[PDB]
Amino acid sequence: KVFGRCELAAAMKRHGLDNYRGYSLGNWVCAAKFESNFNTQATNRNTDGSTDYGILQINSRWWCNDGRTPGSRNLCNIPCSALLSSDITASVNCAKKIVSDGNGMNAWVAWRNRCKGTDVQAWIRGCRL
């Protein structure tokens, strides 16, 4: 599923991400835009053999099990394929764990390089929320 911008903002709000750990909704929408282009089915393979999955590009070395990342953890206790669903619940619940770790949203490369320090409220402007 490729979400619209305001559609995704509303779904993320319903699942409790607005101001989660102090990160306003626009931060989450901006991260999704630059991680996956709002596409739940996005995947990308990394040099280390891990793969990133779904709308927030959650990595198989630490967070989910894909059966092909040796020596990895599954800290979200989910198959990585669950992160590709049109239902973003599993991705949101896992993202809540990730952001609660020591580095906050700096865990997401695209957030740190493309969203942090910018007018992230623009990503929710105009939306019915």
Query: Which residue in 18, 48, 52, 119 is the catalytic one?
Result: 52
Residue 45, H or E segment: strand 43-45
60 binds Na ion per the rule CB under 5 A: yes
Q: How many helices (H) and strands (E) does the chain have?
A: 4, 3
Minimum separation from the CB atom of position 65 to Na ion (A): 5
57 binds Na ion per the rule CB under 5 A: no
User: Is 87 annotated as contributing to ligand binding?
Assistant: no
Task: Give the span between the Cα atoms of 108 and 122, in whole angstroms.
Answer: 19
72 binds Na ion per the rule CB under 5 A: yes
7 is catalytic: no
69 binds Na ion per the rule CB under 5 A: yes
CA 86 to chain centre: 13
50 binds Na ion per the rule CB under 5 A: no
Of the ranges 24-32, 60-68, 86-94, 95-103, which one interacts with Na ion (CB under 5 A)? 60-68
CB within 8 A of 52, min separation 6: which ones? 35, 42, 43, 44, 45, 46, 58, 59, 60
Binding site for Na ion (CB under 5 A): 60, 65, 69, 72, 74
